[PDB]
Structure formats: C-alpha cells, structure tokens
Amino acid sequence: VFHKIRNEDLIFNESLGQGTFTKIFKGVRREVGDYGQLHETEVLLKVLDKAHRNYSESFFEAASMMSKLSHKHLVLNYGVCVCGDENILVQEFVKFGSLDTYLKKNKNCINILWKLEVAKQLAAAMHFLEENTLIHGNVCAKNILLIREEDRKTGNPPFIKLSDPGISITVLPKDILQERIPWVPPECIENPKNLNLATDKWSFGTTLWEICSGGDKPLSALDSQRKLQFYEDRHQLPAPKAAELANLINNCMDYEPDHRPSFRAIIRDLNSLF
Ligand SMILES: O=C(Nc1c[nH]nc1-c1nc2cc(CN3CCOCC3)ccc2[nH]1)NC1CC1
Fold this sequence. Notes:
The protein is built from 9 helices and 8 strands. It is an alpha+beta fold. Residues 10-274 form the Protein kinase domain.
C-alpha cells in the first residue's frame, strides 16, 4: 500500500475546495529529495470528512488504484499522512486546479483546438485504463487537473492529468448517486453493480459536453427526481454551440453499454478532425 509520511513534515495551508465527503487543501511537505537534498514541496492534502469516516475503505482504495499504475496523465500519490483520527491522502499539487473552474473562468478564450487537444489527452488516459482492464468510475471535468496552460505566445499545448475517482459509487448513497446525473450512466442508477469498463465511456461523453459547454453543468436546472425522469425518457444531452463533438458525445453516451465505442475508436474519430 502507501508510503507512510509523518505529521511533523506536513503543513496545512489554504482550503482549495471539496469533493464528495472530503476537504481539499494546499500544503507543504518537508522531505529529503534526490542527493539527500532537503526540499519543502508543495502538496495536496485530501481529508475524508469526520462524519463520513466509515467510507474510509473506498476512499483509500480509489487512490490505491492510481498509485498501482504509472502514466503521464495520471495524478501522482505521495502517501498517506499519519495522524490518528484522520484519513489524509497526500498527492501531487497541480498549479492550475480543476479544468472545471478553468473552463468557467476561461469560457470565452477556448477555441475548439484547445478543447480537442485536452480531449485527446483525456482519451489517452482512458485508453490506458482500458488496456489495463481498470475502471475509473468518475470521469468529470472537476477530476481533471491542469498541469500547464497553453502558452499562447508559443505554440505549446495544455497538459492535463486525471485525479482519483474518490469514494466508489458502489457504496455512496442514492441521493448522492442521483445529482451526478448525467455523469453516472443509466445502468448504475438501476443498481451500482452494473459498474463496468463501459461506465467510463458514458462519463467521458459527459465530460466532453462540459469541455465544450464552457463549464456549464449538464442538466443543472433539474432536481434529482427530474434527473431520473431524464433517463427513463431516455433523452440525450443537447448539442453544444461548439457542436463539432456532439456526435461523439452521443455515441459515447449510448444507453446500451455494449455499444459504446472503445477508447481506441474514440481516439481515431477524435483525430479525424482537421
Ligand atoms: O480537486 C482536486 N484538486 C487538486 C489536485 N491536485 N492539485 C489540485 C488543485 N490545485 C489548485 C490550485 C488552485 C489555485 N489556482 C487559482 C487560480 O488559478 C487556478 C487555480 C486552486 C485549486 C486547486 N486544486 N483534486 C481531486 C479531483 C478532486
């Protein structure tokens, strides 16, 4: 499992946000680096809520997966802080935060080139998970982290990474399973044991919607009840103004899991644009 990192070396700084039953902070780690050097490294500290500690098994196994593989688009895990009454994951601090809020805050300066480049990097990471027969389970723009911006003054591209899935939808309560419509695929609302590789093909389609909709949240005007009726009337998401990917979004968000294209195919289609 995890490298154990002592409390004496971690220093909690500013709240950066929250996830599902989790508090997320910028931090500082003291450590001996390469050549016996001493570093004080910026980290990310993710605390499992005090009330929801019973979820700690899924909370840590979800991070356990990312640390079992190694790929340039997967977020690095440094270890777990050892306190006592706490569950703290220490992870790679990414300077530019969530694609989620980056898209909102930059909604007007994103040409479909920048979008397409980020989608290719995301499919690459999802294709690597697919060949390893490994389920993520929570592909959403808020689980995507921006290592590097475009540098509009050179021709460099952005570079993103993919973070933890967090607590499994296997165990979360149903009210929590139903606001993440349309990220949770329709079979998993039926019963979360429908979790399969095919889950990520649906959710990737929803993230593709988010990336094109300047950070709107799909179906944000609907409450839970209506979100369920969205799936029972088997509707689709509307096509974004930026519409070049509306077909790919729909092919990915297929109501039959066995028909969702492989990420091999998703990449090829994604590459066939000018
Ligand atoms: O939410 C997460 N955030 C991070 C993981 N590693 N590094 C981060 C992270 N890094 C962050 C950095 C900022 C500061 N910048 C302010 C303006 O420019 C953009 C962000 C804010 C929030 C940030 N979160 N991780 C998992 C998906 C739930």
